[PDB]
Amino acid sequence: MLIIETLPLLRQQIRRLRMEGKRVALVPTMGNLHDGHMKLVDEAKARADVVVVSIFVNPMQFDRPEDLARYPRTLQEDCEKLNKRKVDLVFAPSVKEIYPNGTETHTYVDVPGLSTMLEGASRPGHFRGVSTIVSKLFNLVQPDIACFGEKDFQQLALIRKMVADMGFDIEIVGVPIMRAKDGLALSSRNGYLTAEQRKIAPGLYKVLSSIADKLQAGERDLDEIITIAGQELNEKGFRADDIQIRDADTLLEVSETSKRAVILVAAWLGDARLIDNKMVEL
Amino acid sequence: MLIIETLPLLRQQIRRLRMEGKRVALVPTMGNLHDGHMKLVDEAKARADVVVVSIFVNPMQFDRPEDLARYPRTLQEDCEKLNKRKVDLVFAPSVKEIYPNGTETHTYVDVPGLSTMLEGASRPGHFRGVSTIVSKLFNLVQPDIACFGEKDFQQLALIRKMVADMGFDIEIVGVPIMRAKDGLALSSRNGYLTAEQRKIAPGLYKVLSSIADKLQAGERDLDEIITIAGQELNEKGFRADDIQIRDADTLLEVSETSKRAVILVAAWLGDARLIDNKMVEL
CATH class of the missing domain: 3.40.50.620 (HUPs)
Known part of the structure; x- marks a missing residue:
């Protein structure tokens, strides 16, 4: 080398x-x-x-x-x-x-x-x-x-x-x-989760994937999609912190021209602020 | 093609x-x-x-x-x-x-x-x-x-x-x-040159060349180089010269760091206004 x-x-x-x-x-x-x-x-x-x-x-x-x-x-x-x-x-x-x-x-x-x-x-x-x-x-x-x-x-x-x-x-x-095999994004931050928190943590990706499914299925009421996503995270044991959906190419609000979207989620679990993202084809 | x-x-x-x-x-x-x-x-x-x-x-x-x-x-x-x-x-x-x-x-x-x-x-x-x-x-x-x-x-x-x-x-x-082979910078404005003026016109590039040669030999008293060039032009029949010398890389004044110069000159031959330029390696 x-x-x-x-x-x-x-x-x-x-x-x-x-x-x-x-x-x-x-x-x-x-x-x-x-x-x-x-x-x-x-x-x-x-x-x-x-x-x-x-x-x-x-x-x-x-x-x-x-x-x-x-x-x-x-x-x-x-x-x-x-x-x-x-x-x-x-x-x-x-x-x-x-x-x-x-x-x-x-x-x-x-x-x-x-x-x-x-x-x-x-x-x-x-x-x-x-x-x-x-x-x-x-x-x-x-x-x-x-x-x-x-x-x-x-x-x-x-x-x-x-x-x-x-x-x-x-x-x-x-x-x-x-x-990880359970879907959780690998990160140094996972190190701050207790074992019971580590068991809850794959829920973040589940919610993220749920959002993508909706978007892929034509849902465009983003505000509701995001409201439900937060509720779901919170009922799972998280403290939702930030959820955003954008055009993946231009980073602007999704519009009738958007062809791909990027979804960003952050949610607290214990002393960890877990973060994830996913791009979805529109 | x-x-x-x-x-x-x-x-x-x-x-x-x-x-x-x-x-x-x-x-x-x-x-x-x-x-x-x-x-x-x-x-x-x-x-x-x-x-x-x-x-x-x-x-x-x-x-x-x-x-x-x-x-x-x-x-x-x-x-x-x-x-x-x-x-x-x-x-x-x-x-x-x-x-x-x-x-x-x-x-x-x-x-x-x-x-x-x-x-x-x-x-x-x-x-x-x-x-x-x-x-x-x-x-x-x-x-x-x-x-x-x-x-x-x-x-x-x-x-x-x-x-x-x-x-x-x-x-x-x-x-x-x-x-041209006699050194005259080609230009649409050359057409306004009478036969006699076309005969005097190659003098401009001769003076430009002389400036260039001086800068090549190390000379850095620009004001003096430019005043002499103006006198040479006057003697050959030109008037109202406007001559500039710049660092060709930074487009600022020539310095101890200059490696190349651009000389720009404009001069009148009767009612015709001739321009020319020359770059020189220092």
């Missing part, structure tokens, strides 16, 4: 891989890798000849410099994990290598609408940071395929739109949330 | 050229081609196996609908010219092919600083329109080389900065403006 830190050396490896006709997959990350990321790598290994993982804590997508400074860095552990997964190349550049003149005067890429809704409304500049570094990485790595998790549904929608709009010939693979 | 109008069909051709192992030069244009565009094509042909010319009147870089609608569209005559030049492929998409959902919500690319200075300052959104469509063309065509005319020095700097920042593996070639 090669670990590459500079642009010239990356371009050399990438040119040579492609010269040899290898199909390349890219998994962009900011390090601090966990099982979620290992599934992205496994999907990339099955779909391509060569897998490239980028590890870069990107200053452009942080709200303030103190947050950037506190972000966890675990490069050695990250590299041990990817080496065990047989990754071919890790690109781990410094901030000066990527942003030699800083970020403020660097060219950027902005996806209208998606970047300034939901999470992006409370984090100005964040998604601009995401679309800029992912575009740069696509040009540097020239992948055939790139893998992103469905848990971060907003980033996935953002990148899908960026790719379509900017003409990149890259397949974007959205990797579904990993689940 | 192939004429391609849709993205899927262009992509097919780009895949074919990759399989054939051909190096590709791209010449982006907004059509309504003339001899100076033919000079771009000839430079592309000399540097690559295959030449792709794009013809697309990009709404995103137009101030008002009026100006867009009124822009001359002459595809057939453009295509007859490129065929005589032995161009391999012409990409001429429709607006809906490029901007199926309009330009306002389309992903965009912005280059700080360069986009808002000089001509950029009075034309909000204009250079964002350019960086956007050129990035898209680069992603669609994936050329090895792209050719741009030196006369639009602001665009050239804009695209060189975009390429460096966004990580495109593409050589950007600036093509010096077209010129």
